Design a binder for this molecule. Structure first.
Ligand code: MG
Ligand code: ZN
Ligand code: ZN
Ligand code: ZN
Lengths: 87, 171, 276, 550, 112, 97, 180
DNA sequence: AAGGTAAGCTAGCT
RNA sequence: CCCCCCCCCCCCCCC
DNA sequence: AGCTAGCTTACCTGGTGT
């Protein structure tokens, strides 16, 4: 029943990115870069996957989406691009 | 029979393929696996339709490895043979036991005992034939067969057919 | 036992606190929606003191020659005296500060003012005074509308729960009630102008920072708040020497009483009644 | 474990608990299990067609599973069966079996209280399966007659037949592993046979059993009575096979042979000129071993002692926690990539660092994938080898097979390929988990940055002492090395020592300045404390971040 | 009032030994013991007798007797507890696991 | 060295889900089983080499899955089946929350 | 076995018996080939059975359009029908797919109706009959002269259609037949 | 030289 | 199955 | 001899390593 996908308009979760999202995004991207995945940022002499991932996140060039599940099973999708990285 | 079915494969893509020619690689991997395949469930998955409109959807990233899994929704032409389906085909092989008829992707075998009793084998012909007072069934002839049952093996389906009944036989 | 009983409690993407069945334990984590590490003991000023002491601190009466803001406090000083439309705004302000004081004296019945709350306002003002090199000599470029409305507007942005509906919207108001009591008591017109000698540029910076800090302060969905609470009660109990010394009633305490409580022991050691 | 499988990889979303129908046990079974013997097929050291691999899995490193033909680290082992000569109660269900009897007519198999009784209707109404059963039981237990007729919902003057026989109901009491009833000058006392209970349970309606705690698909009440016993494969009951001419059989293997032996004696007895009350002797024994195999620590009964007078581990026993499968092997495990040594303090370490003895760095490794960024660094590390500090221990090819850099004839001529893994030594600045047990705090486990150092102790900054609750009077600490880029991020981004400074437990910092520093800070900051130029310059130079401005 | 009293008592024990534990932690415990009908103890008879996952409840105090009742009454573990994913060697819906991560082909192409 | 129950708790409190999984799988136990999609048991006869699967007494050679679980859990499951209890593992949700 | 293809038909196959039944011309095809199918959009859609002639054209069309897509990504009659098709397959298929080459030769050699124009008219005719998609496909693939031939080879038709109505349709089809 | 409890069940109260 | 080993922090007063 | 009172009884009891 894909009535569980909550539309872009009417999305009540935080516009800010949670610590856990950031940690999983960096971890994911670093692991992907580590396994010879294409990089979306110009590495300015960088060679560490975590540091390359932090660069990708700073320049908002991480092609990932967080699927935020709600208690009933419904969910909201948030583009890493759109989430506020204050912290 | 010969159907158009809506189907969906799950494909795991390694991070090295997370480039802009991504959807491309996915669609080709789909055809590599799916096209030319044969299950007992759906039959022979012969040709995938609407290449331009194959639904990739979002790919969830698998936890400890990098790779991401996509459920590729697609629609294709399938061939599922059935008992009692009357099929038109070409004789491919011929022995003391009978003859095999090619029906599209598959073969249907006709037993000596599932033919009219008048029809009899003749090894002393090049190539071996089944001779009757009227017709001669040999390595190139067109036959109308009635499927009596199927067996699903590895990456094919084989069947046994009769030409005993009315309106069946050489065409 | 504490850990095994709380394991599965976590803060969800709706700020609700639920278990493995998705049953609601708390409607918002810790009744306020804040992460415990972003909280500091702060004094709610309005609560205490003489009623006359409160009046002197907060009351601005532009319709009284001895109770206006002196033209040494702000540029608008001379032109503001006797303005009826602004007194409406300032009466509005003062009535809220009185309402708040009554409300606080209801919550904290004994008049305790020091309560742990998010956003250390004292420090923000200090940093503003430093950053801007505020001179407690020259009249401010703030207007009554600048202070009064600035605060009014900041309150609208102190978001714990997002959601278009009266249930969540009321829920949001409820959650911020106490912080706002502090915020209004600390950013009142007479204080902003006479105590801290804030400029428009400076007051703006204070407001922007309270907002940024307030949002940083909110709990993060995914917080394994259940284990956290179990470990938080658990570990201080291991550092308990007790029982209740070697001697106002000789009541059972420390580990044996905690044991009594968690077990929901029917026949307890020291049953007692306190009759007022 | 290991080797590619074409099967779709998925996760468990649900666990459906239930009971085995005898029909299932037989259908799952790879072998019939007939002989109490383990092997020596006329002395020949090789498993028998009777017990342990009559097709169940290997004892030897044979690579012959017979069933999957897979071999040890791959074959999960396959269940067999034992067809029991007479039915037997499952120890665990004895009381439920008893309670069910107390709710049903022990003759016609009907529910003792119809949806006619008002209090019964209330019980039926109960949504929770477990709670409902307790309500039906307390109501039904006391109903000692199966009513033929009952007063109608309308006028009780006109009684209506609800169905069922008339029969008196026994007052059941448990005696050992048997159930004895009592009907009503003087009562009739007779033991209720396993066969008897089973026949009644097979006759309990689906509506009736589903009204009680039961389920038509997964757990029918009749299934609490064992008819066909599943035989676990060798992986559950390892034959610790020391040498050629020496055994090593597991406790369970012997208990099963006892079960088997008990079963053959009964079947032989019952088939032959059965002296009926010599049958009930061998039958009570079969019940005892099937019972004592699952649970040996049975309430008020003699424990099934081994030859040695050693109680014999029941399966139940292996699952009972704190060192016991669930808590022992599942909620906690012993782990690889871990190290432990004595801790000692160091003022010259950064708050978030941890001093790691060279020995430990040379043992603990991190599997780093060969990428164009590190292809050069890694080749040097491999060249350095397993014995020089910045070095590596293994190279892992695309193939999956490991190259041991301390034995390979090609150890000095490895040309790394992108995608390979180098299991390099733990190096400076790697995130690692550091812990001091009892870990009663989230702070009792924190991520530190490595610092490879001489001497055999872990070294830590004194201000980190407080959250760990550690002294240096011989305290030991654990270190765990993450193996993924994904888990390294987890450590650095969530549980790094600096992140833990201010604790959510009490809304204040959990680390501060202590001891020497706290003592000397008071001393240094007194009014009479004055510092001459010489000392001032060194005090200044000691602060790393110093502006260079006196 | 039971909840209020229960906190008041729990607090008074922590406060007695000098120490201070933030309101929320004790609130959460006091709330768990309360959210059902009345006073659910932090014991084998208390919380462990809740309608949670068979696999999670067995991981504390009654193990086998639990799994036996789970079998008899055909219980279905939803696998949403931490304990279940721990037994299953699966990533639990805890913090880092409380959401999912997806590649968007759209943005992937856009960034190149 | 022991990554015990108490250590599992700190990891939960931190929110380190992947770290917790790695500790309990890759760093210890981790095993691969073939589960039947119908009866949900570890019954599958994976002759993974000839690419043959099969759960007889289901007559299923189609609906088969592979799962990664701690070997100790595989052991647990066999031990429960050993005592007539069926712990059926399913890769899809029947209920829904 | 392998990572095979799923479908849009959702099964409730929980422990329960292999209650599976026969496949015939009682029109009992699989659950997979039920009349009431569900498309990727979730909408219920009727079963798509193809007479050889249709299937020939579907595949050809699909393959031709695929060649077009492969040319975009590259940037940045009777016996000749067989000759040509085997060249399109060289370009769009993996060659290793012997099943499709075999099918194409069969379809090319056994199709009653060549051009799309006629296939459309055949579709239009059998459309109205109200018969099962399978019977409609078999009527397009099997050449029958008498209603007896049709009803004998397609047993399911039995009481579904008049003898003369079927015989009327059979004439329209023999008339619509391409002269190769 | 356990302790507290939640079942259960005998003995002995109508 | 023992055993030990580890832990054994803090603090009596005076404003 | 309806019910209940006083029994009796299983369940658990910190962490790590000769
Ligand atoms: Mg010590
Ligand atoms: Zn095997
Ligand atoms: Zn009866
Ligand atoms: Zn099965």
């Amino acid at each position: 029943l894909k009535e569980k996908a909550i539309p872009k308009d009417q999305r009540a979760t935080t516009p800010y990115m949670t610590k856990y999202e950031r940690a999983r995004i960096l971890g994911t991207r670093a692991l992907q870069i580590s396994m010879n995945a294409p990089v979306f940022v110009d590495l300015e002499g960088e060679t560490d996957p975590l540091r390359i991932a932090m660069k990708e996140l700073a320049e908002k060039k991480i092609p990932l989406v967080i699927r935020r599940y709600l208690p009933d099973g419904s969910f909201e999708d948030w583009s890493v691009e759109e989430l506020i990285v204050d912290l | 029979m010969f159907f158009i079915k809506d189907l969906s494969l799950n494909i795991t893509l390694h991070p090295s393929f997370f480039g802009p020619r991504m959807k491309q690689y996915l669609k080709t991997k789909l055809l590599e696996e799916v096209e030319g395949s044969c299950t007992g469930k759906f039959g022979y998955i012969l040709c995938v339709l609407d290449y331009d409109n194959i639904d990739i959807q979002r790919g969830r990233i698998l936890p400890t490895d990098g790779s991401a899994e996509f459920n590729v929704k697609y629609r294709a032409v399938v061939f599922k043979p059935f008992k009692g389906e009357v099929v038109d085909g070409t004789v491919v092989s011929c022995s003391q036991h009978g003859f095999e008829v090619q029906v599209g992707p598959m073969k249907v075998f006709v037993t000596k005992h599932l033919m009219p009793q008048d029809l009899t084998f003749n090894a002393g012909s090049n190539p071996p034939s089944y001779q009757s007072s009227e017709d001669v069934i040999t390595i190139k002839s067109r036959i109308r067969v009635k499927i009596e049952g199927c067996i699903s093996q590895v990456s094919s389906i084989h069947a046994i057919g009769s030409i005993k009944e009315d309106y069946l036989g050489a065409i | 036992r504490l850990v095994k009983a709380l394991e599965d409690i976590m803060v969800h993407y709706d700020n609700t606190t639920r278990n493995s069945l998705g049953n609601v334990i708390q409607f918002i984590y810790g009744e306020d929606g804040m992460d415990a590490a972003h909280i500091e003991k702060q004094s709610l000023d309005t609560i205490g003191g003489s009623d006359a002491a409160f009046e002197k601190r907060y009351r601005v009466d532009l319709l009284n020659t001895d109770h206006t803001l002196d033209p040494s406090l702000l540029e608008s000083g001379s032109e503001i005296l006797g303005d009826l439309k602004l007194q409406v705004l300032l009466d509005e302000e003062y009535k809220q500060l009185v309402k708040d004081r009554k409300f606080l004296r209801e919550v904290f019945v004994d008049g305790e003012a020091n309560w742990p709350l998010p956003v250390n306002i004292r420090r923000i003002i200090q940093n503003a005074q430093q950053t801007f090199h505020i001179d407690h000599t020259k009249p401010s470029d703030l207007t009554i509308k600048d202070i009064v409305l600035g605060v009014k507007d900041l309150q609208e942005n102190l978001l714990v729960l997002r959601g278009k509906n009266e249930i969540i919207q009321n829920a949001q108001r409820d959650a911020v009630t106490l912080f706002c009591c502090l915020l209004r008591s600390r950013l009142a017109t007479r204080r902003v102008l006479q105590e801290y000698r804030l400029t428009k540029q400076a007051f703006d910076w204070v407001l922007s920072n309270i907002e940024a800090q307030f949002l940083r302060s909110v709990v993060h969905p995914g917080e394994m708040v259940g284990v956290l609470a179990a470990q938080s009660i658990g570990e201080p109990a291991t550092q308990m020497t007790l029982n209740t010394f070697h001697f106002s009633k000789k009541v059972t305490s420390g580990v044996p009483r905690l044991k009594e409580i968690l077990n929901v022991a029917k026949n307890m050691k020291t049953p007692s009644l306190t009759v007022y | 474990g290991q080797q590619y499988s074409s099967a779709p990889l998925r996760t468990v979303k649900e666990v459906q608990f239930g009971l085995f129908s005898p029909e299932e046990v037989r259908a799952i079974s790879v072998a019939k299990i007939r002989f109490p013997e383990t092997m020596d097929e006329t002395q020949t050291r090789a498993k028998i067609g009777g017990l342990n691999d009559p097709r169940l899995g290997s004892i030897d490193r044979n690579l012959k599973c017979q069933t999957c033909q897979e071999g040890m680290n791959e074959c999960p082992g396959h269940f067999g069966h034992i067809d029991l000569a007479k039915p037997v109660f499952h120890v665990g269900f004895i009381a439920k079996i008893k309670k069910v009897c107390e709710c049903v007519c022990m003759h016609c198999g009907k529910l003792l209280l119809d949806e006619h009784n008002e209090l019964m209707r209330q019980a039926l109404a109960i949504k929770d399966s477990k709670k409902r059963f307790a309500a039906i039981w307390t109501l039904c237990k006391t109903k000692m007659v199966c009513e033929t007729d009952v007063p109608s919902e309308d006028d009780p003057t006109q009684l209506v037949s609800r169905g069922g026989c008339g029969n008196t109901q026994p007052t059941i009491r448990k005696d050992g592993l048997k159930l004895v009833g009592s009907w009503k000058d003087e009562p009739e006392l007779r033991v209720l046979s396993t066969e008897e209970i089973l026949n009644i349970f097979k006759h309990i309606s689906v509506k009736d059993f589903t009204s009680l705690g039961f389920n038509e698909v997964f757990s029918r009440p009749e299934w609490m009575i064992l008819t066909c016993l599943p035989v676990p494969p060798p992986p559950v009951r390892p034959s610790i096979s020391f040498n050629e001419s020496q055994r090593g059989e597991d406790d369970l293997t012997f208990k099963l042979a006892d079960i088997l032996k008990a079963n053959i004696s009964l079947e032989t007895l019952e088939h032959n000129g059965a002296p009926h009350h010599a049958i009930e002797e061998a039958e009570s024994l079969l019940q005892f071993h099937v019972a004592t195999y699952m649970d040996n620590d049975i309430a008020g009964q003699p424990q099934a002692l081994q030859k040695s007078g050693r109680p014999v581990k029941s399966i139940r026993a292996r699952l009972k926690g704190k060192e016991g499968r669930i808590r022992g092997n599942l909620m906690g495990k012993r782990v690889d990539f871990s190290a432990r040594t004595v801790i000692s303090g160091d003022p010259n370490l950064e708050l978030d660092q941890v001093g790691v003895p060279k020995s430990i760095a040379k043992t603990l490794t991190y599997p780093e994938v060969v990428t164009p960024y590190n292809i050069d660094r890694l080749t040097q590390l491999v060249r350095n080898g397993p014995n020089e500090h910045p070095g590596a221990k293994y190279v892992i090819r695309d193939s999956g097979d490991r190259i041991d850099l301390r034995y390979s004839k090609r150890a000095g001529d490895i040309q790394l390929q992108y995608g390979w893994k180098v299991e390099r030594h733990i190096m400076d600045n790697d995130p690692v988990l550091f812990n001091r047990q009892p870990s009663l705090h989230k702070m009792s486990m924190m991520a530190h940055r490595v610092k490879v150092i001489p001497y055999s102790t872990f070294r830590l900054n004194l201000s980190v002492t407080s959250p760990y609750n550690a002294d240096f009077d011989g305290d030991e600490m654990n270190l765990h090395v993450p193996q993924s880029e994904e888990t390294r991020a987890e450590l650095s981004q969530l549980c790094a020592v600096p992140l833990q400074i201010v604790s959510p437990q009490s809304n204040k910092p959990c680390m501060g300045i202590v001891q020497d520093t706290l003592c000397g800070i008071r001393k240094l900051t007194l009014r009479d404390t004055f510092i001459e130029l010489d000392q001032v310059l060194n005090m200044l130079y000691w602060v790393p971040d110093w502006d260079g401005v006196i | 009032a039971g909840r209020a009293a229960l906190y008041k008592e729990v607090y008074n024990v922590i406060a007695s030994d000098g120490s201070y534990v933030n309101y929320r932690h004790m609130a959460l415990l006091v709330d768990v013991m309360t959210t059902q009908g009345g006073l659910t103890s932090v014991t084998r008879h208390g919380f462990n007798r809740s309608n949670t996952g068979a696999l999670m409840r067995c991981s504390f105090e009654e193990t086998v007797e639990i799994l036996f009742e789970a079998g008899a009454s055909a219980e279905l573990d939803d696998c949403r507890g931490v304990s279940e994913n721990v037994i299953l060697g699966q990533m639990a819906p805890i913090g880092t696991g409380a959401f999912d991560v997806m590649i968007d082909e759209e943005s992937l192409v856009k960034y190149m | 060295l022991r990554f015990g129950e108490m250590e599992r708790d700190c990891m939960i409190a931190h929110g380190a889900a992947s770290f917790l999984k790695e500790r309990l799988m890759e760093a210890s136990d981790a095993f691969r089983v073939h589960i039947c999609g119908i009866c949900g048991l570890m019954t599958v006869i994976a002759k993974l080499n000839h690419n043959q699967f099969e759960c007889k007494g289901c007559d299923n050679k189609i609906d088969i899955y592979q799962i990664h679980i701690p070997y100790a859990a595989k052991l647990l499951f066999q031990e429960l089946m050993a005592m007539n209890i069926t712990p059926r593992l399913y890769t899809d949700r029947s209920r829904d929350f | 076995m392998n990572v095979s293809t799923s479908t849009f038909q959702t099964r409730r196959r929980r422990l329960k018996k292999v209650e599976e039944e026969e496949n015939a011309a009682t029109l009992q095809l699989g659950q997979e080939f039920q009349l009431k199918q569900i498309n990727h959009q979730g909408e219920e859609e009727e079963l798509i059975a193809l007479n050889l002639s249709e299937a020939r054209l579907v595949i050809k069309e699909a393959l031709v359009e695929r060649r077009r897509a492969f040319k975009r990504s590259q940037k940045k009659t009777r016996e000749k029908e067989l000759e040509s098709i085997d060249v399109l397959l060289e370009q769009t298929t993996g060659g290793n797919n012997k099943d499709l080459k075999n099918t194409m030769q069969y379809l090319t050699n056994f199709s009653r109706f060549r051009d799309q124009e006629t296939v459309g008219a055949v579709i239009q005719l059998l459309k109205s009959t109200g018969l099962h998609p399978f019977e409609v496909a078999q009527l397009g693939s099997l050449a029958c002269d008498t209603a007896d031939e049709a009803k004998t080879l397609i047993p399911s038709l039995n009481n579904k259609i008049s003898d003369d109505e079927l015989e009327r349709i059979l004439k329209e089809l023999s008339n619509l037949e391409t002269l190769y």
